[PDB]
Amino acid sequence: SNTIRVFLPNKQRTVVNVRNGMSLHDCLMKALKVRGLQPECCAVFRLLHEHKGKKARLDWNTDAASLIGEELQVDFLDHVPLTTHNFARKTFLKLAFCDICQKFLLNGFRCQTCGYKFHEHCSTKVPTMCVDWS
Amino acid sequence: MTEYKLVVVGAGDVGKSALTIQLIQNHFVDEYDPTIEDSYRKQVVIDGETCLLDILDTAGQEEYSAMRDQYMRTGEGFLCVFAINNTKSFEDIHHYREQIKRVKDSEDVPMVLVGNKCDLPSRTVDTKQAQDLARSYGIPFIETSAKTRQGVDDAFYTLVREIRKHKE
Ligand SMILES: Nc1nc2c(ncn2[C@@H]2O[C@H](COP(=O)(O)OP(=O)(O)NP(=O)(O)O)[C@@H](O)[C@H]2O)c(=O)[nH]1
Ligand SMILES: [Cl-]
Ligand SMILES: [Mg+2]
Ligand SMILES: [Zn+2]
Ligand SMILES: [Zn+2]
Ligand SMILES: [Zn+2]
């Protein structure tokens, strides 16, 4: 009953059950980290069901209980170097090694953006967010 | 890239969240953390095709049964999870499949029976029982341990392959 519905980056969401005294940050750290998202790379917003403004930024240390029954959204900060991978299949003619298991890689997959290279059966261990400082 | 909407269902304490987080973040913790509603997106390569899994992890209890109804309506495939050391969670699988059939108006729904916690020695549901249940339902059975990652990819890959067959 003491819950908040929180939309999260990359079209994800969580419903948090608020323990009194906890901040928004306390309530959402795990949800973000388990999705491979750093809290330091994000901002939290209150959704405004009114025109001329879709959302209003909130302080991360805001008391969570005070927003029970509202809808919040966590978004990436402007221009953070995080994106989604762009996987392509790749045959490695020269000897190559998987970035996940360090075994030989002959037929595999490779992110065209960050260069992560891996076996098909290692793909679920590739980090969720692609880091692009190129 | 094709997106696959998956829903993880089953009784409380059977490891639905642990299985999902193992898949998403390659990580296992022993902490019990009650789920109300959690969706995750993750790219995966399955049979040489990159696809996007959109995974919904649900609460098992009757309080949220009307929420589950809506989740299940748009779900394309279902992981029905029980714990191999909890016979009640195994028999309760039947209630979740009945619930899914109600919102899908079909018996032909992509579905995998998942027997989790296979690392534990206190096993009360044996492999043969679960295969028989899965056979009577016409769906695959996969043994998993979210603790060791055993069979975790296999459960989600098998469900995607069931969805692909169904969409033929
Ligand atoms: N040994 C072992 N423990 C497991 C395994 N999977 C989950 N557990 C443990 O079982 C407990 C419940 O796990 P959890 O994923 O939260 O279960 P749940 O199905 O999400 N329950 P709920 O519906 O309340 O959200 C935790 O202590 C977790 O560590 C497994 O494969 N092996
Ligand atoms: Cl090797
Ligand atoms: Mg859970
Ligand atoms: Zn990448
Ligand atoms: Zn590998
Ligand atoms: Zn029952």
Numbering used by the authors:
A (entry chain B): 55 to 188
B (entry chain A): 1 to 168
How does the study describe this entry?
Active RAS recruits RAF to the membrane where RAF dimerizes and becomes active. Here, we present crystal structures of wild-type and oncogenic mutants of KRAS in complex with the RBD and CRD of RAF1.
To understand if oncogenic mutations at G12, G13, and Q61 positions in KRAS have any effect on KRAS-RBDCRD interaction interfaces, and to identify any druggable pockets at the KRAS-RBDCRD interface, we attempted to crystallize and solve the structures of G12C/D/V, G13D, and Q61L/R mutants of KRAS in complex with RAF1(RBDCRD). We were able to obtain well-diffracting crystals of G12V, G13D, and Q61R mutants of KRAS complexed with RAF1(RBDCRD) and solved their structures in the resolution range between 2.11–2.87 Å. Since the mutant structures belong to the same crystal form as the WT KRAS-RBDCRD structure obtained in crystal form II, we used this structure to examine any structural changes in KRAS and at KRAS-RBDCRD interfaces. The side chain of R61 in the KRAS Q61R-RBDCRD structure points towards the KRAS-RBD interface and occupies an empty space surrounded by KRAS residues Y64, P34, and I36, therefore not impacting the KRAS-RBD interface. These results suggest that RAF1 does not differentiate between WT and oncogenic mutants of active KRAS.
